[PDB]
Structures are given as structure tokens and as C-alpha cells.
């Protein structure tokens, strides 16, 4: 249209529309939704029964190398009736292509972990346990990383408030550094920022 607008391309939008299509064709057992992003990204929605073999299928091939496990993350979504959302991100070395794996779950239902499939998930997989409580299956060493020793909260979900309950202080009553209920000097004034009038036409909801 003009300068100062991102020039999109169609070549990568073509092959990523082409490549991911016959992925669901050759495993119609686990794949439940595939979508192409408008900027050359791919999602393969997978029910977590096939958490191991689909990775194991992308672990090796002759048309898809994909042996660079970059990113394990975790996203919570309340009001979904199955809250959490484990999302991978893996890289083909020989092909320069990004693709993500979106696998939902719930809290108490475990997930067969990727421990034999990848050995870069040694510290990433434990993190979701410490922050959410998503108990992955058959991990050789589940422990506590990046949190303090006495928490019971799994803080990165939404019901855990901004401060905890555990504002710490010292006294010379004997020697100890003792815990106490939390007390702030200031509210953290919470604003109200959502302007009305719906700046977006394309993502318009079903109007019910």
C-alpha cells in the first residue's frame, strides 16, 4: 500500500501451507487442528495422547530434521474448562523453519514427558512443576528450581496475587529471620485502561 507497512511475501506462506498439510494426512491419530499464521508460522494442535510419538516423528526423518529444541513454555488460560496450555517450539536445522506444538492438558491429568525424546528438557520440564503443579510423567529427578523453599503457591497462575503472603523481616528476639503476614507501604494503585469502541474489525466476535 505504502512505505512504513511491512512487505509480506507469499513464497514462505505457500510452502508452510504446503508442508504442514500432509503432516495431518500421515498421522490422523493425534492431530486435531492445524493452522497457518499470516506471517509464516504453524501450529499443530495435538491431544496429549501423542505427546511422545509426534515429537519422536519430528525427532528424525529425511524430509524434516527438527532436532533443535528451543523453547518449552507454559501459558495458563482460565475460562477454558481445561486451564493450562503447554506449548513447545522446535527448529529445523537444515531447513530454517519454525513450528510450534500446542498441547492442552488440565491440572491433575499428567503428561508423558519428553525425557528420552529430548535431553534439553531437563530443567525446562521441572519449571512447570514449580510454577503450576503440572506433574509430568516419569521424570528421573523432579525438584524445586527458581522458587524459595517454603512456598505452597505455584505462583505463575492467576489466583496468586501480586504480592504473596510472606513479607519477611528480622528481629533480635533471638537470632531468627522470621516470616510474617504481608504489609505494604502503598496500594499498588490499579488503573483502568480499556478504552471502548472496538478498534479491530477483523477479529470481531460471533455476535450471539
Amino acid at each position: 500500500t505504502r512505505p512504513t507497512v511491512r512487505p509480506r511475501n507469499d513464497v514462505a506462506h505457500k510452502q508452510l501451507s504446503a508442508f504442514g498439510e500432509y503432516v495431518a494426512e500421515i498421522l490422523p491419530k493425534y492431530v486435531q487442528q492445524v493452522q497457518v499464521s499470516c506471517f509464516n508460522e504453524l501450529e499443530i494442535c495435538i491431544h496429549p495422547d501423542g505427546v511422545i510419538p509426534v515429537l519422536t516423528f519430528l525427532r528424525d526423518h529425511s524430509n524434516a530434521q527438527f532436532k533443535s529444541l528451543a523453547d518449552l513454555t507454559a501459558v495458563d488460560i482460565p475460562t477454558r474448562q481445561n486451564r493450562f496450555e503447554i506449548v513447545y517450539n522446535l527448529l529445523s536445522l537444515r531447513f530454517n523453519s519454525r513450528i510450534r506444538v500446542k498441547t492442552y492438558t488440565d491440572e491433575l491429568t499428567p503428561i508423558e514427558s519428553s525425557v528420552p525424546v529430548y535431553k534439553a528438557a531437563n530443567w525446562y520440564e521441572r519449571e512447570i512443576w514449580d510454577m503450576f503443579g503440572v506433574f509430568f510423567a516419569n521424570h528421573p529427578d523432579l525438584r524445586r528450581i527458581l522458587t524459595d523453599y517454603g512456598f505452597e503457591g505455584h505462583p505463575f497462575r492467576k489466583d496468586f496475587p501480586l504480592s504473596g503472603y510472606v513479607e519477611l523481616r528480622y528481629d533480635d528476639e533471638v537470632k531468627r529471620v522470621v516470616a510474617e503476614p504481608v504489609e505494604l507501604a502503598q496500594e499498588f494503585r490499579k488503573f483502568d485502561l480499556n478504552s471502548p469502541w472496538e478498534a479491530f474489525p477483523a477479529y470481531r466476535q460471533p455476535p450471539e
Binding site: 522458587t147 524459595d148 523453599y149 503457591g153 505462583p155 496468586f160 501480586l162 504480592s163 504473596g164 510472606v166 513479607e167 519477611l168 523481616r169 528480622y170 529471620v177 505494604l184 499498588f188
Partner: protein, 152 residues
């Protein structure tokens, strides 16, 4: 007495002439102190030597941001110091914990644990106001040891 009070103009001068500091590198306020060690604003030989073992310290410096996993380890090193000690904390995250201040796991203040004497403000204090804080500290030593047991 003119005879006895003349003596503490040597001893309370001698302690403000040789300070052997510890530094706790934790966050981005550690890096700027290294440039004070770099010989532009050469920190050595203006009264004060470089790094030193944890035993032989007088002036401890907390720099950066404290977490609850470090609140026990701070007090234990603070016990092992000898008696005429002083605590001086640089960095705006050692005075109220900067921002990160409303977070669930950051020590609010670095004052509810140790008693600190001189507060330098700022995300990084630019190794320009920090020598000014140290000359403030030697200016703070105008105290006396005589006319304390000579009074009471």
C-alpha cells in the same frame, strides 16, 4: 582533657584511612563498581584497597536486589564481621528494592534485615556520586572513644 582527647585524632583518623570493603555482586549495580575499580576513577590507593577476604572487612556493600533465598546468607556474613563496622548500600534496589518492589519474592528495603548508614540513590549510581558517598562516610567519622569512658 587536652592530653587524652588528642589521641583519638589519630585512632578515629586511622580507621577512616584504611577501609577494606566487601562487595556483593548481585545485579547491574555490580558492573558499575568494576568501572570504579577500572583506573579512570581509580578506586584503589585513595585510602581503600581492592577486594578482600570475608574475614578482614570493615565496610560491607550490598549492591543490587535481594531475594528471600539470600536473606539468611546475608545475616550470617554480617555476623562474622568485627565490631567497628558500617553498612553502605548503593543502588536504588537496596533502598526499598527499586521497582521489583511489588513482587512476591524481593526483600523490601535491605533495611529490615541489616542496619545501613549511607544511602546512595539510583539505577546505576554512575561511579561518580559513589566516591562522593565514600567521602561522606569518612566525613561521618567525627566520633570519639575518649570522652565516653572519661564521661561515664
Amino acid at each position: 582533657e587536652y592530653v587524652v582527647a588528642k589521641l583519638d585524632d589519630l585512632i578515629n583518623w586511622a580507621r577512616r584511612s584504611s577501609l577494606w570493603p566487601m562487595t556483593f555482586g548481585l545485579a547491574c549495580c555490580a558492573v558499575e563498581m568494576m568501572h570504579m575499580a577500572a583506573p579512570r576513577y581509580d578506586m584503589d590507593r585513595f585510602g581503600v584497597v581492592f577486594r578482600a577476604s570475608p574475614r578482614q572487612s570493615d565496610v560491607m556493600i550490598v549492591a543490587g536486589t535481594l531475594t528471600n533465598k539470600m536473606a539468611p546468607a546475608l545475616r550470617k556474613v554480617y555476623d562474622q564481621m568485627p565490631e567497628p563496622r558500617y553498612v553502605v548500600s548503593m543502588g536504588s534496589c537496596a533502598n526499598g528494592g527499586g521497582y521489583y518492589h511489588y513482587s512476591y519474592s524481593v526483600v523490601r528495603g535491605c533495611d529490615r534485615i541489616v542496619p545501613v548508614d549511607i544511602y546512595v540513590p539510583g539505577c546505576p549510581p554512575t561511579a561518580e556520586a559513589l566516591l562522593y558517598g565514600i567521602l561522606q562516610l569518612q566525613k561521618k567519622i567525627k566520633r570519639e572513644k575518649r570522652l565516653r569512658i572519661w564521661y561515664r
